[PDB]
């Protein structure tokens, strides 16, 4: 019933563009929206985010997160490891690679979402969420080696899965960090389950 | 270590702008980023709210109330938590309960309110509060609830059982062209993972 009629470029940077989208509303009235897109998409999605479940015997299961300065936020954020998918790369492969580069952990794929939207009122940006388990007792994950790309500066923060939401709240309260909405949503549901 | 040095307007719409962000990297070197912001944020502690609405009714399994809308940036239909921008002077809780009623017809009760969390921090400064609200589906107010959508706003309500959320989302994605939001999918995943 609703659909895109046209898109007008407003401004294109190296990484991001802003468009004016014209669309037909379900009454048959014509309407405009300001839309953001990445200039990098080729892929099933722009990016992957990895939910990394660190499993060590005789320990709580942990969710492995990352902390990094985010220029658009003007501050540090706590997030799932994540990055853009390389042209020709599979989401699964992008997940294991990003996870290794950002955390040093080598992990196994458990499940992979369809493409899901990041902020559909604002952008067309999509990701695959990839659940990965990490056998923390294997020698390759003993002293995990983070291999950052150029200009990446990532701190790793592992938090117990069964207390994730209280732990994140603590970090916000004391460290003045910004938690990612997908992280926070996952944490909420761990508490809301049953 | 890292901080913003300057922010230069590249293009400003009515709703969104694009900025050339200059910052200090942790090595002491100056770098740039392209940043999206909204033009609408004033003194709100966040741009918007998303509501996690837990519909509770005697002798029913709890349902998560979700909305389906056409999203011009995406060029299609998306399934999301009920959400909107926080009006100037409005509390996040008030905005959550107001958007929930407008989008779904339901009158909720506040359960909890997150701190400001980031929507896509590699791209934008956009933030929300994620507000958990219970809905007393036994109350006569919530019996046959009518959305009160604004001018040009057209929302469908989809209530799904919490205890099977991920499979039910997967089944809807299998039947039609539509994208699930990343926060909704994250929440459904953690419910499975718990
Ligand atoms: C469908 C009816 N309607 C019109 C508006 C006004 N436009 C915007 O809020 C907006 C925000 C971000 C980018 N572009 C446009 C809100 N609902
Ligand atoms: Cl798991
Ligand atoms: Mg990354
Ligand atoms: Mg990376
Ligand atoms: Mg809305
Ligand atoms: Mg609304």
From Swiss-Prot, chain A:
Changing residue 33 to A: Reduces affinity for substrate about 6-fold. Strongly reduced catalytic activity and strongly reduced affinity for substrate. It is found in: Nucleus. GO terms for biological process: ATP generation from poly-ADP-D-ribose; chromatin remodeling; D-ribose catabolic process; nucleobase-containing small molecule metabolic process; nucleoside phosphate metabolic process; nucleotide metabolic process; ribonucleoside diphosphate catabolic process; ribose phosphate metabolic process. Mg(2+) 2 binds at residue 98. The keyword Cell membrane does not apply. Pfam families: NUDIX. One of its GO terms (cellular component) is nucleus. Widely expressed. Most abundant in liver. It comes from the Eukaryota. It catalyses: D-ribose 5-phosphate + ATP + H(+) = ADP-D-ribose + diphosphate; ADP-D-ribose + H2O = D-ribose 5-phosphate + AMP + 2 H(+); 8-oxo-dGDP + H2O = 8-oxo-dGMP + phosphate + H(+). Mg(2+) 1 binds at residues 82, 102. Substrate binds at residues 15, 33-34, 38, 70, 84, 119. Residues 43-183 form the Nudix hydrolase domain. Binds 3 Mg(2+) ions per subunit. Its EC number is 3.6.1.13, 3.6.1.58, 2.7.7.96. Phosphorylation at Thr-32 is required for homodimer stability; dephosphorylation results in destabilization of the homodimer. Dephosphorylation at Thr-32 promotes the ATP-synthesis activity. Mg(2+) 3 binds at residues 98, 102, 152. GO terms for molecular function: 8-oxo-dGDP phosphatase activity; ADP-ribose diphosphatase activity; ADP-sugar diphosphatase activity; identical protein binding; magnesium ion binding; nucleotidyltransferase activity; protein homodimerization activity; snoRNA binding. Changing residue 38 to Q: Reduces affinity for substrate about 15-fold and reduces catalytic rate about 17-fold. The keyword Nucleus applies. Belongs to the Nudix hydrolase family. Homodimer. Interacts with PARG. Enzyme that can either act as an ADP-sugar pyrophosphatase in absence of diphosphate or catalyze the synthesis of ATP in presence of diphosphate. In absence of diphosphate, hydrolyzes with similar activities various modified nucleoside diphosphates such as ADP-ribose, ADP-mannose, ADP-glucose, 8-oxo-GDP and 8-oxo-dGDP. Can also hydrolyze other nucleotide sugars with low activity. In presence of diphosphate, mediates the synthesis of ATP in the nucleus by catalyzing the conversion of ADP-ribose to ATP and ribose 5-phosphate. Nuclear ATP synthesis takes place when dephosphorylated at Thr-32. This is ADP-sugar pyrophosphatase. The gene is NUDT5.
From Swiss-Prot, chain B:
Induction: Overexpressed in cancer patients with a poor outcome. A motif (Nudix box) lies at residues 84-105. It is found in: Nucleus. Keywords: Acetylation, Hydrolase, Isopeptide bond, Magnesium, Metal-binding, Nucleus, Phosphoprotein, RNA-binding, Transferase, Ubl conjugation. Changing residue 15 to A: Reduces affinity for substrate about 8-fold. Strongly reduced catalytic activity and strongly reduced affinity for substrate. One of its GO terms (biological process) is chromatin remodeling. It holds the Pfam family NUDIX. Widely expressed. Most abundant in liver. Residues 44-184 form the Nudix hydrolase domain. This is ADP-sugar pyrophosphatase. The gene is NUDT5.
